[PDB]
Write a protein that binds this ligand. Structure first.
Ligand code: CLA
Ligand code: CLA
Ligand code: CLA
Ligand code: CLA
Ligand code: CLA
Ligand code: CLA
Ligand code: CLA
Ligand code: CLA
Ligand code: CLA
Ligand SMILES: CC1=C(/C=C/C(C)=C/C=C/C(C)=C/C=C/C=C(C)/C=C/C=C(C)/C=C/C2=C(C)CCCC2(C)C)C(C)(C)CCC1
Ligand code: SF4
Lengths: 144, 118, 119, 37, 732, 80
C-alpha cells in the first residue's frame, strides 16, 4: 500500500444542490474531499441533507468538516460495502491524505502502528491535583 | 453543488448588484462612502422627524429629527472606523476602509443637511 | 524634562504608552496657535471638506510654540469657565494683589516625579 | 468651596451615559480583536 | 492568533466568540493562568485586595458627596420623623412633566430619589449635623481611596513585592489584626464616640476646631488614672432627653443601661461607647497570644498537634492541619466566607431587633431594606463559602498530608453525613408541607377550628427566660425571686425589662403557630441547602458514578451520555443547584420578616396570627394585598412616585423569565440555529461584505447555567426589592 | 485540543474505535491482554470530545478517557 493522490477531475454524484454545503471556511481555512469507487449506480443519502445518485465508477464529493466525511464513510461502508478515503485540502492546494492513514482501516490491528496517548497504569493510579499545581498552564493529573 | 433560485442567479439581479455602489471595483472608497452616506442619511432623516419626541411642536420637529439623524450618522461612522480597525490589521484594506468611513461621515451629514434644506 | 528622568521636540515623556500621533500633535498645535492668536487679538462646507481631504492625502519651534499654545488655550477655557472673566481681567486680578484641586494637583504632581525615581 | 454648579448633571450624566461608554466599548472592542504578532 | 486574553494562550487561540466570554470569566482565577507561580499568586491577590479597598472607599465617598450636594440632611435633622431622606437628584431627559412633578416631592427643587439605606440615621447618630461635615468626609474618603489604589500599584512594584514568607506568616498577621485592626480600631471608635458623638447628641458641637479644648467629662482622666471608673457612669441621660439638644442631658460617657433611648427608640451612645471600649480591650489582649519574634507566645502548629483526643475517636485529630490551612487559599477563603456570612446574618438579626441609630425603627422602609439587604448578602456569602470549600477539595487537598485527621475522616463518613441531611430535609419537607396543606383544606372547607396549630413552647420558654412576662413561665429573668434577676437588677436589667415587655418594638416579638410553621420551613431551607452544598463538597473528589471527578477540575460540563447520562455531575453544578435553595430560603425568611413587621406596624398582629397558618392566607393577605399601590404606580389615569417601582417590578419579572430560557433550553438547538444564521449572513448579498472576526457559536453548557442563574437571581432580587420598598413606603 | 488517554485495563474489544465519529483512535499491537490489542489516540487534534468512545467502553472503570481542553476550529465541530 502507498498513499494515493487526489484527482480533482473525478466526476461527482448527481445532486441538485443543497443549502447545507460549503461556506467561507472552505475558501479561507480548509475543506475535505471524499473519494470512492462504486460498483453500480445507486441512490445514497447526503450527510448535509437530501438524496443523491452515485455514479458507476469513481465518485467525488467535498464537505466542510471531518464528521461529515466520517458519516458518509460509515454509510457507504456499512450499507453499500464500499471502501472510501477522504482527504484534507487547503486553499494553498496542499492535499493531506487520511482515513485509512495506514491503508488498513483503524478498526483492526495492523503491525507498524505506534501507540500514542497510552498511560501504562490504571485510572485510579493517577496523582492528586495538588501534585500538579503551578505548572505553566491548567493541567489534569492524567496528563503526566 | 449550490441550490439554484431565480433570486440568486437572475441576470437582472446580477446587473443591479453590479450597479450598486458597493460593487463597482474601480471607483474610490471615498466616492463609495459619500454615495452610500448621501443615500442613508437622506433616508434616515425621516422617521426621527415624523415620530420623535418633538414631533408635535412646530418648526422644531424637523430640526430635532435632523439633529438626531446627524448624531446617528456620527455613531455609524464611529462603528465603521472601529470595524476597520478590527478587521484589517481597495475597499478591503485599512487605509481604504478609513477613507470609506470618512466618506460615509461626510456623505451622511450632507444627506441629512439636504433632507433638512427641504 | 525633569532631573533624573529616563526615556521609554521630544523629551522622553510617555507615561501612558506614533507618526499619526506626531502629525496629530502638530495639527492640534497649529490650530491652537491660530486660536490663541485669535483669542489674544480679540479684545463653507464642501470647500472645507476639499481642503481637509487634500491635507489628509498629503522644526522644533513649531511644536514648542504649539505645546505652549495648547496649554494657553486650556488656560483660556479653564480660567474663563471658573473665573467668569477674560484673560486680561484674570491677569489684572492676578497682578497687584478648584483651589483644593490646584493645590492637591501640584503636590500630587511632585509626589509623582519622586515616585518614578523610587520605582 | 465644594458645591458643583447648577449645570452639572446636564453635562456629567450624558458624558458617563453616552460618551465614556462609547469610547470604552470602542477601545475594548479594538483591544479584543487585536492580532498577536 | 489574538492577544486577549493575555493570561491564557489556550483561550487566546480560540477562533470563536467563546474566547471573549471565557476571558471575562477566567480573569480573576489566578491559580490557572499561564506561568503562574506561588509568590506571584499571593502578590496579585494582595494588589487585588488593595483594589477592593479603594473601590469601597470611593463608594462611601460617593454616597457622602451625593447626600451632601443633592439631599436634605440639614433639613432632616430638624424633624427626622416627618421628612423623607433624599438619596440623589434625578436627571432623566426621557421624563415628562408629570414625572418631573411626581418625583419632585419635597423639599427639593427637581426630581429626587428617597433613600432607604439608613445613612442619614447612621450619620446623624455618629455626630454629623451639617452638609460641610459630609463634604469633608467625602473628600477624606476619596483621598483614602486614591491612597489604597496607589498602594496596590506600589506593592506590585519589584522593589516592593513581598516574599512568600511574608504572606505565610500567620502568627504576626493574627497578632497585628487582632490587636491593631480589631482592638485599636474599636478603641479609636470609642474615642470618636466619647469625644464627638455623645456631645453632638448633648447639643454641643465638637469638631476639629475645638476637640482639644472641650472636656469629654467634667473630671478628665482623674477617674481613669485613679481607678474610680464608676465616676464616668454617674448622671446618665434622663428618660426625657431630646436627642441632639441639651434638655434632659447628663454627664456620663460610659453607662451600662440596657434597652433603648426613649425618644429615638435606639441604643444608648454611652452603652455603645462602653461596648466598643470593652471589646477593644478584649481584642488588644487577645492580640498578644501568638508567637512573633519575642520568645513568648503560642505556636499554632503545636496547638493543633496537641489537640488530638485519646482512644482514636478523632483518629490523628488535628495533625497536619496547619500545613493545609496555611498552604491553601481556598480553605482560608471558605473559612472567611463562612464567618462573614454568619456575621452578616447576625448583623441583620440584631439590627432589626436592637436598632442602634436615632430614629431608625420609625423608618420602616429603611428597616425592611437593611434587613433584606444583609440577609441576601449573607446567603450569597454562605453559598460561596461552600463553593470555595469544594474548590479546596479538588485543587488544594493532599491526602497523604492528611492521612487520618479530621478532614480525611469527614470524607470517610460522607455517606452518613449526606444520608442524615437527606433524612432531615425529607422529614421537614413532608411535615411542613403536610401541615400547611392540612390547614389550607381546613380553611377551604370552612372549618378553621380543625387545623393543626402547634404552639412554639420552646422559643416561648426562651423568651420567658429572657424576661418576657407574656407566656407565664416566670423563670430566671421573668421571676422576681431569681438570682440572675436580683444580680443584674441594679444596673442593666431595668431598661432591658421595659424594652422586652414593650410589645411595640421588634425586641423579642410575640410568637405563635404561624411562627412555628415558618421557623420549621426555615430549618427545611437551611438543611436542604446544606445538603446540596455538603454533597457537592464531599462528592467533589469523585463518586461511584464518576470516580475520577478530581481529574476534570471544579467546573466541567458533564461526562457525556454514557453510563446512563451524567448531567450536572460537577461540584460547580451542585453549587449552581444550591443557589436556588438559597434564594428560596432567604425569600421565605424575608417574606416572614416583612409580613410580621407590616402587621406590627399597621397595628393588627391578629391578621398575621390568623392568616399566617395557611398558604392561601399568605398569598391573599401578603402578596395580593400589599401589591395594590405598587401596580397602580402608573395606569391610564396618570402616574405617581411609585411608577419607578412598578416598572422595576415588571423589569424583575422579565429578567427572571428570561433566565428560565437559559435554564430550560440547552445548547445544541441554539448551535443549529446559529449555523443557519451563519449560512444566511454568508449568502446574503451586500451584507456578506461585512464578516465577523470571531466565529459565532452558541453559549457553552456551563456558561448557559451561569447566565441563566444570573438572570434568575437579578430578577428575583429586583422583584422583591421593588415590592418591599414600594409596599412599605406607599403604606407608611 | 482535547486530552484523550488510553489505560492498561484495555481488553482490545475495538468498541471505542468503531464508536468514534472522527477517526481519532486506532488499534495497535500489544501483549497486555488476551486480544493482543490496545487502543491508541494518535489524532487527538481532530477530537471533538463527544465521548462515544467512553460510552462504548465496557471496562469498569473506563480504559479510554476524554479530558475536555482548549478549543480549536476542529474540536468545536464547526463547518464555518
Ligand atoms: C444614559 C444615557 C442617555 C441620555 C443622556 C439619553 C438622552 C436622550 N435620549 Mg435616550 N436612550 C438611551 C440612553 C440615553 N439617552 C438608551 C440606553 C436607550 C435604549 C434603551 C435610549 C432610547 C432612546 C430613544 C428611542 C429616544 C431617546 C431619546 C433621548 C433624548 C430625549 C428626548 C428629548 O426630549 O430630547 C430632544 C432631542 C433632541 C434635541 C435631538 C437628540 C439628538 C442628540 C442631542 C444628538 C447628540 C449629539 C452627539 C454628537 C451624538 C453622538 C453622541 C455619541 C458620540 C456618544 C435625550 C437626548 C429620544 C431622541 O433621540 O430624540 C430625538 C428618542 O426618540 N432615547
Ligand atoms: C493632543 C495633542 C497632542 C498629541 C497628539 C501628542 C502626542 C505625542 N506627544 Mg505631546 N504634548 C502635548 C500634546 C500632544 N501630544 C502637550 C499639550 C504637551 C505639553 C504638556 C506635550 C508635551 C510632550 C512632551 C515633553 C513629549 C510629548 C511626546 C508625544 C508623543 C508620545 C506620547 C504618547 O503617544 O503617549 C506623541 C506623538 C513625546 C515625544 O516624543 O515628542 C515628540 C515627548 O517627549 N508631548
Ligand atoms: C463611586 C461612587 C459613585 C456613584 C455610584 C455615583 C453616581 C452618580 N453620580 Mg456621582 N460622583 C462621585 C461618586 C459616585 N457617583 C464622587 C466621589 C464625586 C465627586 C468627585 C461625584 C461627582 C458627581 C457630579 C458632579 C455628578 C455626579 C452624578 C452622578 C449620577 C449620574 C452618573 C454620573 O454621570 O456621574 C459621573 C461620576 C463622577 C463625576 C465621579 C466618578 C469619578 C470616579 C473616580 C470614577 C470611578 C470609576 C469606577 C471605579 C469604574 C467605572 C468604569 C468601569 C465600569 C468601566 C449618579 C447617581 C451626576 C448627578 O448628580 O446627576 C443628578 C453629576 O452631575 N457625580
Ligand atoms: C427609556 C428608557 C430609559 C433610559 C435609557 C433612562 C436613562 C436614565 N435614567 Mg431613567 N427612567 C426610565 C426610563 C429611562 N431612563 C423609566 C421608565 C423610569 C421609571 C419611571 C425611570 C426612572 C428613573 C429614576 C428614578 C432615575 C433614572 C435615572 C436615569 C439615568 C441614569 C444615569 C446613569 O447612571 O447612566 C449610566 C448607567 C448606569 C451607571 C447603570 C448601568 C449599569 C451597567 C450597565 C452595569 C454593567 C456594567 C458592565 C461592567 C458594563 C460596563 C460598560 C463599560 C464599557 C463602561 C439615565 C439617563 C437616574 C438619574 O437620573 O440619575 C442621574 C435616576 O435616579 N430613571
Ligand atoms: C457586600 C456588600 C455590602 C453592601 C453594599 C453593604 C451596605 C451597607 N452596609 Mg453592610 N455589611 C456587609 C455587606 C454589605 N453591606 C457585610 C458582609 C457585613 C458583616 C461584616 C456588614 C455589616 C454591616 C454593619 C454592622 C452595618 C452595615 C451598614 C451598611 C450600610 C451603610 C454603608 C456603609 O457600610 O458605609 C461604609 C463603611 C466604611 C467605609 C467603613 C466604616 C469604618 C470602619 C468600620 C472602621 C474604620 C477604622 C479606621 C479607618 C481606623 C483608624 C485608626 C486610627 C488609629 C487612625 C450599607 C447599606 C450599616 C448600616 O446598616 O447603617 C444604616 C451598619 O451599621 N453593614
Ligand atoms: C497592626 C497593623 C495592621 C493593620 C491595621 C492591618 C490592616 C489590614 N490588613 Mg494586614 N497585615 C499586617 C498588619 C496590619 N494589617 C501585618 C503585620 C502583616 C504581615 C504578617 C499583614 C498581612 C496582610 C495581608 C497579606 C493582607 C492584609 C490585609 C489588611 C486589610 C484587611 C481588609 C480590610 O480592610 O478589612 C478591615 C476589617 C475590619 C474593619 C474588621 C471587620 C470586623 C467585622 C467583620 C465588621 C463589623 C464591625 C462593625 C460592627 C461594622 C460597622 C460598619 C459601619 C458601616 C457602621 C486591613 C487594612 C489584606 C488586604 O486587604 O491588603 C490590601 C491582605 O490581603 N494584611
Ligand atoms: C483611642 C483613641 C483616643 C485618642 C486619640 C484620644 C485622645 C485624647 N483624649 Mg480621649 N478618650 C478615649 C480615647 C482616645 N482619646 C477613650 C477610650 C475614653 C473613655 C475612657 C476617652 C475619654 C477622655 C476624657 C475624659 C478626656 C480625654 C482627653 C483626650 C485628649 C488628651 C489626652 C491626654 O492628654 O492623655 C494623657 C497623655 C498620655 C501620653 C497618657 C495616655 C497613654 C496611653 C493610655 C497609653 C498608650 C495607649 C486627647 C485628644 C482629655 C481631653 O482634654 O480632651 C480634650 C480628657 O479630659 N479622653
Ligand atoms: C472574599 C471574596 C471572594 C474572593 C476574593 C473570591 C475569589 C474567587 N472566586 Mg469566589 N465566591 C465568593 C467570594 C470570593 N471569591 C462569593 C461571595 C461567591 C458566591 C457568589 C463565590 C462563588 C464562586 C464560584 C462558583 C466560583 C468562584 C471562583 C473564584 C475564583 C475566580 C473568580 C473569577 O474568575 O470569576 C470572574 C467573575 C465573574 C465572571 C462575575 C460574573 C458576574 C456574576 C455572574 C454576577 C452577575 C450579576 C450582575 C453583576 C448584575 C447586573 C444587574 C444589572 C441590572 C446591572 C477566585 C479565586 C471560581 C473558581 O474558583 O473556579 C474554579 C468559581 O467557579 N467563587
Ligand atoms: C414547589 C417546588 C419544589 C418542591 C416541593 C421541592 C421539593 C424538594 N426538593 Mg426541589 N427544587 C426545586 C423545587 C421544589 N423542590 C427547584 C425550583 C430547584 C432548582 C433546580 C430544586 C432543586 C433541588 C435540589 C438540588 C434538591 C432538591 C431537593 C428537594 C427535596 C428536599 C427534601 C424535602 O423537603 O422533601 C419533601 C418532599 C416533598 C416536598 C414532595 C411532596 C411529596 C408529595 C406531596 C407526596 C405525594 C402527594 C400525592 C399523593 C401525589 C399524587 C400525584 C399522583 C399523580 C402520583 C424535596 C422533595 C433535595 C432532595 O431531593 O433531597 C432528597 C435536593 O438535594 N431540589
Ligand atoms: C465545605 C468546606 C468548607 C466550608 C465549610 C463551611 C462553609 C462551614 C460552615 C460552618 C458554619 C456556618 C458553622 C456554624 C457554626 C455555629 C456554631 C458552632 C454556633 C455556636 C453557638 C454557640 C455555642 C452559642 C451559644 C450561646 C447561646 C445559644 C445563647 C447564650 C449565649 C451563648 C454564647 C452561650 C471548608 C472551608 C472548611 C473547607 C473544607 C470544605
Ligand atoms: S470523543 Fe468523540 S472523538 Fe474524541 S475519541 Fe471519543 S469519540 Fe473519538
Amino acid at each position: 500500500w502507498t498513499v494515493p493522490t487526489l484527482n480533482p477531475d473525478t466526476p461527482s454524484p448527481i445532486f441538485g444542490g443543497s443549502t447545507g454545503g460549503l461556506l467561507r471556511k472552505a475558501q479561507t481555512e480548509e475543506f475535505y474531499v471524499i473519494t470512492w469507487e462504486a460498483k453500480k449506480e445507486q441512490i445514497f443519502e447526503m450527510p448535509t441533507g437530501g438524496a443523491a445518485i452515485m455514479r458507476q465508477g469513481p465518485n467525488l464529493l467535498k464537505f466542510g468538516k471531518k464528521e461529515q466525511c466520517l458519516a458518509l464513510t460509515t454509510q457507504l461502508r456499512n450499507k453499500f460495502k464500499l471502501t472510501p478515503c477522504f482527504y484534507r485540502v487547503f486553499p494553498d492546494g496542499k492535499v493531506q491524505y487520511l482515513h485509512p492513514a495506514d491503508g488498513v482501516y483503524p478498526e483492526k490491528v495492523n503491525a507498524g502502528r505506534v501507540g500514542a496517548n497510552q498511560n501504562m497504569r490504571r485510572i485510579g493510579q493517577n496523582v492528586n491535583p495538588i501534585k500538579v499545581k503551578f505548572s505553566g498552564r491548567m493541567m489534569s493529573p492524567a496528563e503526566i | 453543488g449550490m441550490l439554484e433560485t431565480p433570486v440568486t442567479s437572475a441576470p437582472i439581479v446580477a446587473t443591479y448588484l453590479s450597479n450598486l455602489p458597493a460593487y463597482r471595483t474601480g471607483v474610490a472608497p471615498v466616492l463609495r462612502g459619500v454615495e452610500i452616506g448621501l443615500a442613508h442619511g437622506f433616508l434616515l432623516a425621516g422617521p426621527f422627524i415624523k415620530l420623535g419626541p418633538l414631533r408635535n411642536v412646530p418648526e422644531t420637529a424637523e430640526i430635532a429629527g435632523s439633529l438626531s439623524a446627524a448624531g446617528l450618522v456620527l455613531i455609524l461612522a464611529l462603528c465603521l472606523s472601529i470595524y476597520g480597525s478590527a478587521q484589517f490589521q481597495p475597499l478591503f484594506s485599512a487605509d481604504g476602509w478609513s477613507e470609506f468611513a470618512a466618506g460615509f461621515l461626510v456623505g451622511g451629514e450632507a444627506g441629512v443637511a439636504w433632507a433638512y434644506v427641504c | 524634562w525633569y532631573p533624573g528622568a529616563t526615556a521609554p521636540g521630544d523629551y522622553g515623556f510617555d507615561p501612558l504608552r506614533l507618526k499619526w500621533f506626531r502629525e496629530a500633535e502638530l495639527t492640534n498645535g497649529r490650530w491652537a496657535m491660530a486660536a490663541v492668536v485669535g483669542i489674544l487679538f480679540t479684545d463653507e462646507v464642501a470647500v472645507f471638506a476639499v481642503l481637509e481631504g487634500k491635507r489628509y492625502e498629503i522644526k522644533l519651534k513649531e511644536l514648542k510654540n504649539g505645546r505652549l499654545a495648547m496649554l494657553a488655550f486650556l488656560g483660556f477655557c479653564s480660567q474663563a469657565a471658573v473665573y467668569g472673566k477674560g484673560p486680561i481681567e484674570t491677569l489684572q486680578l492676578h497682578l497687584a494683589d478648584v483651589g483644593p484641586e490646584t493645590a492637591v494637583t501640584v503636590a500630587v504632581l511632585c509626589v509623582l516625579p519622586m515616585i518614578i525615581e523610587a520605582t | 468651596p465644594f458645591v458643583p454648579p447648577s449645570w452639572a448633571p446636564s453635562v456629567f450624566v450624558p458624558l458617563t451615559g453616552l460618551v465614556l461608554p462609547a469610547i470604552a466599548m470602542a477601545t475594548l472592542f479594538v483591544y479584543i480583536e487585536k492580532e498577536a504578532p | 492568533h489574538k492577544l486577549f486574553p493575555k493570561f491564557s494562550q489556550g483561550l487566546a487561540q480560540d477562533p470563536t466568540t467563546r474566547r471573549i466570554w471565557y476571558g471575562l470569566a477566567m480573569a480573576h482565577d489566578f491559580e490557572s493562568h499561564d506561568g503562574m507561580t506561588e509568590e506571584n499568586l499571593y502578590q496579585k491577590i494582595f494588589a487585588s485586595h488593595f483594589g477592593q479597598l479603594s473601590i469601597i472607599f470611593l463608594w462611601t465617598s460617593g454616597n457622602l458627596f451625593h447626600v451632601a450636594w443633592q439631599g436634605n440632611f440639614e433639613q432632616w435633622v430638624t424633624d427626622p420623623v416627618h421628612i423623607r431622606p433624599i438619596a440623589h437628584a434625578i436627571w432623566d431627559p426621557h421624563f415628562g412633566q408629570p414625572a418631573v412633578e411626581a418625583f419632585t416631592r419635597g423639599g427639593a427643587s427637581g426630581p429626587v430619589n428617597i433613600s432607604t439605606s439608613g445613612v442619614y440615621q447612621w450619620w446623624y447618630t455618629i455626630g454629623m449635623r451639617t452638609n460641610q461635615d459630609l463634604y469633608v468626609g467625602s473628600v477624606f474618603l476619596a483621598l483614602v481611596s486614591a491612597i489604597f489604589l496607589f498602594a496596590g500599584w506600589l506593592h506590585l512594584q519589584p522593589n516592593f513585592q513581598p516574599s512568600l514568607s511574608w504572606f505565610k506568616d500567620a502568627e504576626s498577621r493574627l497578632n497585628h489584626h487582632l490587636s491593631g485592626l480589631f482592638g485599636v480600631s474599636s478603641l479609636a471608635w470609642t474615642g470618636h464616640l466619647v469625644h464627638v458623638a455623645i456631645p453632638e447628641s448633648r447639643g454641643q458641637h465638637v469638631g476639629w476646631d475645638n476637640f482639644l479644648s472641650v472636656l469629654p467629662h467634667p473630671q478628665g482622666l482623674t477617674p481613669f488614672f485613679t481607678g474610680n471608673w464608676a465616676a464616668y457612669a454617674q448622671s446618665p441621660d434622663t428618660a426625657s432627653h431630646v436627642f441632639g439638644t441639651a434638655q434632659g442631658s447628663g454627664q456620663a460617657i460610659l453607662t451600662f443601661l440596657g434597652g433603648f433611648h426613649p425618644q429615638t427608640q435606639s441604643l444608648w451612645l454611652t452603652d455603645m461607647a462602653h461596648h466598643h471600649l470593652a471589646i477593644a480591650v478584649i481584642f488588644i489582649v487577645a492580640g498578644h497570644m501568638y508567637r512573633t519574634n519575642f520568645g513568648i507566645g503560642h505556636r499554632m502548629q503545636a496547638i493543633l498537634e496537641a489537640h488530638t483526643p485519646p482512644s482514636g475517636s478523632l483518629g490523628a485529630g488535628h495533625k497536619g492541619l496547619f500545613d493545609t490551612v496555611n498552604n491553601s487559599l481556598h480553605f482560608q477563603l471558605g473559612l472567611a466566607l463562612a464567618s462573614v456570612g454568619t456575621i452578616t446574618s447576625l448583623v441583620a438579626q440584631h439590627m432589626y431587633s436592637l436598632p442602634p441609630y436615632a430614629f431608625q425603627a420609625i423608618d420602616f422602609t429603611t428597616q425592611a431594606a437593611l434587613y433584606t439587604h444583609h440577609q441576601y448578602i449573607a446567603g450569597f456569602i454562605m453559598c460561596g463559602a461552600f463553593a470555595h470549600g469544594a474548590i479546596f477539595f479538588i485543587r488544594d487537598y493532599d491526602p497523604e498530608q492528611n492521612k487520618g485527621n479530621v478532614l480525611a475522616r469527614m470524607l470517610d463518613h460522607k455517606e452518613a453525613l449526606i444520608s442524615h441531611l437527606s433524612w432531615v430535609s425529607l422529614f421537614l419537607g413532608f411535615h411542613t408541607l403536610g401541615l400547611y396543606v392540612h390547614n389550607d383544606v381546613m380553611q377551604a372547607f370552612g372549618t378553621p377550628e380543625k387545623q393543626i396549630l402547634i404552639e412554639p413552647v420552646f422559643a416561648q420558654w426562651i423568651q420567658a427566660a429572657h424576661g418576657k412576662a407574656l407566656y407565664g413561665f416566670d423563670f430566671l429573668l421573668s421571676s422576681k425571686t431569681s438570682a440572675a434577676f436580683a444580680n443584674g437588677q441594679s444596673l442593666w436589667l431595668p431598661g432591658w425589662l421595659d424594652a422586652i415587655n414593650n410589645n411595640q418594638n421588634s425586641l423579642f416579638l410575640t410568637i405563635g403557630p404561624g411562627d412555628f410553621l415558618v421557623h420549621h420551613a426555615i430549618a427545611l431551607g437551611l438543611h436542604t441547602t446544606t445538603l446540596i452544598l455538603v454533597k457537592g463538597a464531599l462528592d467533589a473528589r469523585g463518586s461511584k458514578l464518576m470516580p475520577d471527578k478530581k481529574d476534570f477540575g471544579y467546573s466541567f460540563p458533564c461526562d457525556g451520555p454514557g453510563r446512563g447520562g451524567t448531567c450536572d455531575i460537577s461540584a460547580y453544578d451542585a453549587f449552581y443547584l444550591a443557589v436556588f435553595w438559597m434564594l428560596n430560603t432567604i425569600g421565605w425568611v424575608t417574606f416572614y420578616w416583612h409580613w410580621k413587621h407590616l402587621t406590627l406596624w399597621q397595628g393588627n398582629v391578629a391578621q398575621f396570627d390568623e392568616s399566617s397558618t395557611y398558604l392561601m392566607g399568605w398569598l391573599r393577605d401578603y402578596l395580593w394585598l400589599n401589591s395594590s399601590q405598587l401596580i397602580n404606580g402608573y395606569n391610564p389615569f396618570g402616574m405617581n412616585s411609585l411608577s419607578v417601582w412598578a416598572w422595576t417590578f415588571l423589569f424583575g419579572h422579565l429578567i427572571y423569565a428570561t433566565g428560565f430560557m437559559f435554564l430550560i433550553s440547552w445548547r445544541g438547538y441554539w448551535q443549529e440555529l446559529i449555523e443557519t444564521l451563519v449560512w444566511a449572513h454568508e449568502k446574503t448579498p451586500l451584507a456578506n461584505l461585512v464578516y465577523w472576526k470571531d466565529k459565532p457559536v452558541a453559549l457553552s453548557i456551563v456558561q448557559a447555567r451561569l447566565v441563566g442563574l444570573a438572570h434568575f437571581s437579578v430578577g428575583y432580587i429586583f422583584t422583591y426589592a421593588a415590592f418591599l420598598i414600594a409596599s412599605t413606603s406607599g403604606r407608611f | 485540543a482535547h486530552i484523550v488517554k488510553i489505560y492498561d485495563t484495555c481488553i482490545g474489544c475495538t468498541q471505542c474505535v468503531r464508536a468514534c465519529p472522527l477517526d481519532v483512535l486506532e488499534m495497535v499491537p500489544w501483549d497486555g491482554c488476551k486480544a493482543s490489542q490496545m487502543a491508541s489516540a494518535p489524532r487527538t487534534e481532530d477530537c471533538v470530545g463527544c465521548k462515544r468512545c467512553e460510552t462504548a467502553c465496557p471496562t469498569d472503570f473506563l480504559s479510554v478517557r476524554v479530558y475536555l481542553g482548549s478549543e480549536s476550529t476542529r474540536s468545536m465541530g464547526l463547518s464555518y
